[PDB]
Design a protein around this ligand. Structure first.
Ligand SMILES: [Mg+2]
Ligand SMILES: [Mg+2]
Length: 390
């Protein structure tokens, strides 16, 4: 919900411009339990919106020139319902540029504009984050010791940049290595990173569905001494298997959360979570997006459930996730990948002690290079403009 009382009926969408920004991860990402090398190259589709002679910038997906043509001339007020929530039809395309615009216009950070009761006025926003970049980077190595040292040094690269919590890909034995050896390698890797991370470092493991229940129990038992904070997508979500898993964990006093929800999720996943089978929901920060997450976060909060938006493959979402924490009480972590996108200055954000310090600057606090984005729009993007209707 957004305070819309300051939005004049005068204010209309005057222009929508679109461009793909390009860049690179700090370290090339290898395989995961289900698919191959993710690589080093990164892109972010951005829209620059002009309303009342002022621009906002943000992630935009599922928007064609034709789609934007129909929106030119609409009143900003008409894009919201009276609750202050951007209408469904505009979310994936325009929520981010619009929220960025409102922030620049009101001179406030988005988190301030969507702040829930759990977050009081004037306060610095500091959000937990974890390093998500620990992919299967060891598949060229035969020697388990060598694989562990490689993965440890990778974790160390993040540690030196202020990461304290690490999500480690596992499920090597599902597709990419023989099952027995792959699972042994998974365990050695996780034990190795936990050592580098220290006792206070939270460790998450993500199998990308490569396990079954008995493999999951074997791996958890081997990691009973590890500060394992959550297990994510051990196998495609299933209420019976997750009930058994939770009972098994309880009897052993092993305090590991169950996380799921990315990709093609079960339509019943939220029901299953309310029954205590899944603890952390992980729908993506871009699709279904920020506005949807505000609505979903409220609901999950009411049930004592936890929110951890998936972010991978879109650098912009990392910064978006930060702001969302102000609106959702049981926000867990920003999923962090070290990415440099040309023309997208994220300098205002700093990583310290396993947390991302969100700047108090207008909008999403990301400073876009107006000159470069104009060049990109002209060269490889598009513009739609004019005035109102129809
Ligand atoms: Mg995952
Ligand atoms: Mg799943």
């Amino acid at each position: 919900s957004l305070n819309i009382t300051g939005i004049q009926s005068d204010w209309k969408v005057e222009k929508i411009e679109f461009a793909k920004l390009t860049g690179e991860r700090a370290r090339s990402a290898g395989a995961n339990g289900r698919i191959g090398v993710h690589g080093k190259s990164c892109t972010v589709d951005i829209a620059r919106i002009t309303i009342d002679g002022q621009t906002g910038y943000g992630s935009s997906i599922h928007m064609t020139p034709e789609w934007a043509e129909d929106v030119i001339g609409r009143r900003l007020l008409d894009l919201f319902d009276d609750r202050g929530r951007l209408r469904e039809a505009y979310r994936l395309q325009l929520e981010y540029p619009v929220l960025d615009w409102l922030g620049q216009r009101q001179g406030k950070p988005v988190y301030d504009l969507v702040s829930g009761a759990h977050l009081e006025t004037g306060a610095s926003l500091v959000v937990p984050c974890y390093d998500t970049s620990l992919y299967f980077d060891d598949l060229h190595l035969a020697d388990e010791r060598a694989a562990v040292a490689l993965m440890q040094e990778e974790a160390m690269q993040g540690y030196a940049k202020g990461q304290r919590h690490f999500k480690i890909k596992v499920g090597r034995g599902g597709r990419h290595m023989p099952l027995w050896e792959g699972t042994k390698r998974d365990i050695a890797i996780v034990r190795g990173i936990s050592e580098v991370a220290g006792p206070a470092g939270k460790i998450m493991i993500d199998a990308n569905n490569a396990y079954n229940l008995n493999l999951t129990k074997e791996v958890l038992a081997a990691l009973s001494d590890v500060n394992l904070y959550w297990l994510e997508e051990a196998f495609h979500e299933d209420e019976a298997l997750y009930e058994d898993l939770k009972e098994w964990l309880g009897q052993r006093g092993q305090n590991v959360l169950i996380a799921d929800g990315e990709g093609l999720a079960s339509p019943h996943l939220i029901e299953w979570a309310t029954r205590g089978r899944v603890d952390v929901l992980q729908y993506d920060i871009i699709w279904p997006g920020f506005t949807h997450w505000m609505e979903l976060g409220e609901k999950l909060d009411a049930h004592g459930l936890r929110s951890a938006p998936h972010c991978y493959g879109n650098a912009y979402g990392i910064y978006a996730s930060g702001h969302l924490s102000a609106a959702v009480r049981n926000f867990e972590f920003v999923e962090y990948d070290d990415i440099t996108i040309e023309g997208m200055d994220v300098s205002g954000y700093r990583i310290e002690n396993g947390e991302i310090h969100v700047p108090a600057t207008p909008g999403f606090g990301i400073v876009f290079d107006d000159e470069l984005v104009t060049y990109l729009i002209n060269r490889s993007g598009w513009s739609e403009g004019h005035h109102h209707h129809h």
